Nucleic acid binder design. Structure first.
Lengths: 121, 359, 654, 37
DNA sequence: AATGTTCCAGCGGAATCGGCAGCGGG
């Protein structure tokens, strides 16, 4: 699931039917505590970020970042937050819209009797 | 033919022979017929499987495929058999070798080396056979009588006691009787009709035991009792009967040879053997041994046994069955006759002892 | 003389033996080894009626035996100048090396020094062939390297296993490079992992590197969880092949490090595609000996289960449920005291904990921990004698400090009380984790069965522990064991040559009960077990426990599933309920006749119930009682009302 | 058994077993009668 | 040549019956 997963990521029929599936994949990869799974998940989110930027998918991008942030806050995982903040991935930061040239600030602003039975034996 | 094949048969045969030779070369053959097996146990099993497989694979397509292999095969087998004479299974391979080697002529005396090899080995084994037992002896007889002997006519006196031994070991092991018959046929036609002549009086009297059934052997039903083919036939001549006939035609009857087939072949041999030679089953027409056969074993009637009835108790004499009972027990040629004859002979001897010294 | 001069000089059985003797003489004359190697690697191509030759490959293929004998007579030279030409003639060099290797392997009986010398000499020159397994090398060459190495370290042993005894750094670098590449695919990596039983026996620092590269293999080459690609596709076939390779390698070398990978991948799926092979492998692992490494295996899987490891509860349960349990059962030892005493002290402590119902996640983790610990205790007690837990043995000696006045009955009651507390627990106010706590109660009762089956086989502790309930405070037993909501379906009807083939392998380098819906209730089998036990332990009725079952069974207010489960138990234990049959009519016949039996009036339990109830005829006399008579008549009327069932066989059966 | 095809294949194996048994017993009957007492 | 008769050819009803499938058992 290294190159075939990437080819799944690059394109499909619609902009769905592989989104939620890979959401489950990264969720179960986060469930197991092996770091390479976390690296695979960060690669997946990087690919999703570039694909959303290059395919006008800001809605999916921001919804996914908010959902994953809430989920990882809910569950007892820290090292995933460690690597994410070491990289920095959050919602769009330019103008809350498609395209602009504003430096990233939204990510920065959002992420700094019976008992007798026993003894009568 | 559909698959486009020029000489694949030749290569497969050659590789089969090479594989067999390699297996025999490293097998450590040091069940055994005399209280001895200081050898690897799983080697004889392998050897036996290979030997039977060879006998049921090698003889077919015996053609020029096997011709370049005879000398090498026979030489390896004869070496490793000379070093291991108690094997019972080098002789089977020798039998197959010689049968294939005389199916193609290969014998009119290179080739002469193989011929001298078999002359020596055949005489050697024909002398060593005199010390062997049932399976080893049967294999040795099979090999010996499988020798060409159309060309090995040399000292047939050495091979006659083998042939007749085979005839004795028939009546209980049919394949060996078949081998004896085939060998006698080959010797009669191909050997010169002047050196065989003094030996017929020795050979044929061994055949007599095969003519001892008088149409009383009805042990099994001599007709169809019930078959699915019979059931189908009883309701008409149609497709189901055709199917039952088509499946039963290719029964592949590999049961070796029935005893009645052997008896028929014995009669055909006797007839085909002439009328001069033919008379040699019997004795020699009022010599000493005939007139010794006309005298009762004992002149005075003993074993007077009174059969118990309700009122009489008449006396018969058991001393009149003893001859026929003994020749029956020895050479019954029928298992169910033989067991009854042996039982009666046991009882007779025991009666003999009892009357020898009773009250 | 074998070269055409005009298609091809055909050999024979004698034409080849002559040449064999001839060149055996030629080698007998003098050294001639350098010349022999020289024209053995000669690249002059031949052709026949196509070309596909090198006249050295043909030359070697013809003889290959006297050539190898001469090449082994003076091994050190021939090997050196053979690997001298590794780069330009890799095919023929590899073929000759394999030929000498398996020639020596054939001759490992008379000698042992020669194969070792050959292996050490090849390793001494392992640098000479680095282009073979380097990057950009053809994949066929890499497989050639793998097969060559497999032969090299299969002939004698992994004598290059420790402290760089041989050219260990080169071997290990080659092996890790082969396993670590990304362009390469799953089956070559499978034949690579076939060579693990030789490298999973070395100390840490490099075993860490092997573990890390194995983890990188498991990731990025295996399904997300499992069975995400369907059977038939090359992905599925390759994944299955790699799994079989891993499992046979693991069953060959009882290496703890492979457990934390095999069980790790097994137990993130609800049930794996090829799980039965996992359990067969584990059974093979445990049931052969070397008690210390068995303890190591148990400890490894136990550490996986016990450690914090924030993850799914289902995965943690699966750890013990599949891997550890099948390890414990099959064969560990009758004296495997190490894990035994290691777990006694800490299992009970976890059992003596308090359910922190604040977060569902931590509560689920606690339930799973207790369930696993106490299934472990179940298997402990089941496969273990009685004295070594009650007598003057290491029971008091380990649960308390040293020998104690009490004999062995401290841990017994210490766990039994909490057993009974767990499975006789009120559930009225709890509605958050139903199935999980149900499994906890079930396993509670299972190991209760196993323990009390070994408490000095006393006549009556079974009634007071297994069967005694306190309904006045909603302290029940079977209302906890049974789900009481899953409607059951109940369908209507359903020597020398062994050595030779081993040499060929080296050269090629290739070679009770019905589980329907209800007997699978994780308490059914042990229940029948202790019932058949305590019947065969020592006629109004047996003291109080069949009275308990009778009251729970012969009562149409006890909810349906308890009655069904008890009826199935009676069916499976009719052998022991037979001499008390006269009481088991109103319950059994009442259940069969009752039209509230489930579904359409299920026609499977009725079949077995009637077969059992009619088994003891001449006994139990279904007449003489008006309720019994009316129940029988109801049964008969209903039974003939439903006979047809268009299938002919079942109609005849009815 | 609700699957007619699976039952049929199981009896394919079974019936070829009785066919082989019948052929081998028919072959054996010859010498079995020949040497029977 | 107009027509009626004879003759030949073709279709269908009805009874029979055999085997062709498909369907259970071994």
């Amino acid at each position: 699931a290294e190159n075939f997963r990437v080819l799944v990521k690059q394109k499909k029929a619609s902009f769905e039917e592989a989104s939620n599936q890979l959401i489950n994949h990264i969720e179960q990869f986060l469930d197991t505590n092996e770091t390479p799974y976390f690296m695979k998940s960060i690669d997946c989110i990087r690919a999703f970020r570039e694909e959303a930027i290059k395919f006008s998918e800001e809605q999916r991008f921001n919804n996914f970042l908010k959902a994953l942030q809430e989920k990882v806050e809910i569950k007892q995982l820290n090292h995933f937050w460690e690597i994410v903040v070491q990289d920095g991935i959050t919602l769009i930061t330019k103008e809350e819209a498609s395209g602009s040239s504003v430096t990233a600030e939204e990510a920065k602003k959002f992420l700094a009797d019976v008992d007798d039975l026993l003894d009568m034996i | 033919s559909i698959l486009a094949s020029e000489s694949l048969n030749h290569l497969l045969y050659d590789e089969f022979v090479k594989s067999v030779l390699k297996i025999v070369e490293k097998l450590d053959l040091t069940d055994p017929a005399a209280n001895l097996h200081p050898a690897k146990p799983k080697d004889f099993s392998a050897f036996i499987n290979l030997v039977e497989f060879c006998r049921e694979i090698l003889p077919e397509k015996q053609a020029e495929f096997f011709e370049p292999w005879v000398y090498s095969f026979s030489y390896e087998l004869i070496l490793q058999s000379t070093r291991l004479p108690l094997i019972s299974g080098f002789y089977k391979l020798l039998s197959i070798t010689v049968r294939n080697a005389k199916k193609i002529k290969y014998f009119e005396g290179e080739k002469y080396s193989c011929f001298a090899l078999f002359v020596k080995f055949g005489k050697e084994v024909a002398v060593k056979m005199k010390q062997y037992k049932d399976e080893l002896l049967a294999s040795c007889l099979t090999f010996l009588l499988s020798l060409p002997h159309n060309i090995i006519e040399l000292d047939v006196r050495a091979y006659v006691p083998a042939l007749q031994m085979a005839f004795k070991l028939g009546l209980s092991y049919t394949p060996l009787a078949e081998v004896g018959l085939n060998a006698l046929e080959e010797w009669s036609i191909y050997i010169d009709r002047h050196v065989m002549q003094p030996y017929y009086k020795d050979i044929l009297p061994c055949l007599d035991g095969y003519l001892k059934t008088s149409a009383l052997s009805d042990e099994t039903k001599n007709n169809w009792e019930v078959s699915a083919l019979s059931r189908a036939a009883q309701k008409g001549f149609n497709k189901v009967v055709l199917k039952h006939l088509k499946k039963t035609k290719n029964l592949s009857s590999n049961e070796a040879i029935s005893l009645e087939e052997i008896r028929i072949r014995v009669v055909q041999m006797l007839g085909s053997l002439g009328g001069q030679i033919n008379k040699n089953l019997l004795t020699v027409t009022s010599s000493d041994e005939m007139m010794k056969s006309y005298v009762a074993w004992d002149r005075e009637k003993r074993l007077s046994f009174a059969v118990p009835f309700r009122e009489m108790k008449p006396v018969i004499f058991l001393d009149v069955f003893l001859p026929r009972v003994t020749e029956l027990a020895l050479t019954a040629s029928d298992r169910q006759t033989k067991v009854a004859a042996c039982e009666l002979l046991h009882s007779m001897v025991m009666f003999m002892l009892g009357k020898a010294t009773q009250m | 003389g074998i070269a055409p001069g005009q298609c091809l000089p055909s050999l024979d059985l004698s034409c080849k033996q002559l040449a064999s003797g001839l060149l055996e003489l030629a080698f007998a004359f003098g050294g001639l080894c350098e010349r022999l190697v020289s024209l053995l690697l000669n690249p002059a191509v031949l052709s026949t009626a196509v070309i596909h030759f090198s006249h050295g490959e043909y030359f070697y293929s013809l003889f290959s035996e006297t050539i190898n004998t001469e090449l082994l007579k003076n091994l050190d030279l021939a090997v050196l100048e053979l690997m001298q030409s590794s780069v330009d003639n890799t095919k023929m060099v590899s073929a000759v090396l394999n030929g000498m290797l398996d020639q020596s392997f054939r001759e490992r009986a008379n000698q042992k020094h020669q194969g070792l010398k050959l292996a050490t000499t090849i390793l001494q020159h392992w640098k000479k062939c680095d282009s073979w397994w380097a990057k950009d090398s053809p994949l066929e060459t890499k497989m050639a390297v793998l097969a060559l190495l497999a032969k090299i370290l299969q002939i004698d042993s992994s004598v290059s296993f420790n402290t760089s005894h041989g050219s260990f750094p080169e071997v290990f670098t080659t092996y890790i490079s082969l396993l670590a590449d990304t362009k390469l695919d799953l089956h070559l990596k499978g034949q690579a992992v076939t060579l693990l039983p030789f490298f999973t026996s070395l100390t840490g620092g490099s075993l860490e590197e092997l573990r890390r590269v194995l983890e990188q293999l498991i990731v990025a080459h295996f399904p997300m969880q499992s069975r995400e690609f369907p059977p038939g596709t090359p992905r599925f076939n390759n994944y299955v092949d790699c799994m079989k390779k891993f499992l046979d390698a693991l069953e060959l070398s009882q290496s703890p490090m492979l457990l934390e990978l095999m069980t790790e991948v097994l137990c993130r799926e609800q049930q794996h595609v090829m799980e039965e092979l996992f359990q067969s492998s584990f059974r093979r692992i445990a049931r052969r000996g070397s008690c210390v490494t068995q303890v190591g295996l148990l400890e490894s899987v136990y550490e996986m289960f016990r450690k914090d490891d924030p993850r799914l509860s289902f995965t943690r349960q699966s750890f013990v449920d599949r891997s550890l349990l099948t390890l414990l059962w099959h064969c560990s030892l009758d004296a495997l005291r190490e894990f035994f005493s290691t777990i006694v002290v800490d299992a009970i402590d976890v059992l003596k904990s308090r359910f922190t119902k604040l977060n569902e996640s931590t509560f689920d983790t606690q339930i799973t921990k207790k369930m696993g610990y106490y299934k472990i205790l179940d298997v402990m007690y089941s496969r273990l004698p009685k004295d070594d837990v009650h007598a003057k043995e290491s029971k008091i000696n380990q649960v308390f400090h040293g020998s104690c006045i009490t004999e062995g009955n401290e841990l017994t009651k210490t766990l039994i009380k909490l057993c009974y507390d767990a499975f006789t627990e009120n559930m009225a106010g709890e509605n958050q984790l139903l199935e999980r706590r149900r499994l906890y109660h079930c396993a509670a009762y299972n190991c209760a069965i196993s323990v009390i089956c070994c408490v000095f086989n006393e006549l009556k502790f079974y009634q007071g522990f297994l069967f005694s309930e306190k309904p006045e405070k909603n302290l029940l037993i079977f209302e906890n064991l049974i789900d009481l909501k899953r409607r059951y379906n109940f369908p209507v009807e359903v020597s020398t040559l062994s050595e030779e083939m081993s040499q060929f392998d080296f050269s090629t380098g290739v070679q009770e009960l019905e589980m329907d819906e209800l007997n699978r209730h994780e308490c059914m089998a042990p229940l029948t077990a202790l019932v058949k036990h305590m019947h065969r332990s020592l006629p109004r009725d047996l003291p109080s426990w069949m009275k308990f079952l009778h009251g729970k069974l012969g009562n149409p207010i006890v909810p349906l599933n308890i009655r069904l489960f008890l009826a199935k138990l009676v069916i499976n234990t009719e052998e022991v309920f037979r001499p008390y049959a006269k009481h088991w009519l109103s319950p059994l016949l009442q259940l069969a006749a009752s039209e509230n039996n489930g579904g359409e009036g299920i026609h499977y339990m009725v079949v077995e119930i009637v077969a059992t109830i009619l088994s003891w005829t001449g006994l139990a006399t279904p007449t003489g009682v008006p309720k019994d008579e009316v129940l029988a008549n109801r049964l008969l009327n209903f039974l003939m009302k439903h006979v047809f069932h268009p299938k002919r066989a079942v109609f005849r059966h009815n | 058994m609700r699957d007619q095809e699976k039952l049929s294949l199981m009896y394919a194996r079974k019936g070829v077993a009785e066919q082989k048994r019948e052929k081998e017993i028919k072959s054996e009957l010859k010498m079995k009668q020949d040497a029977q007492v």
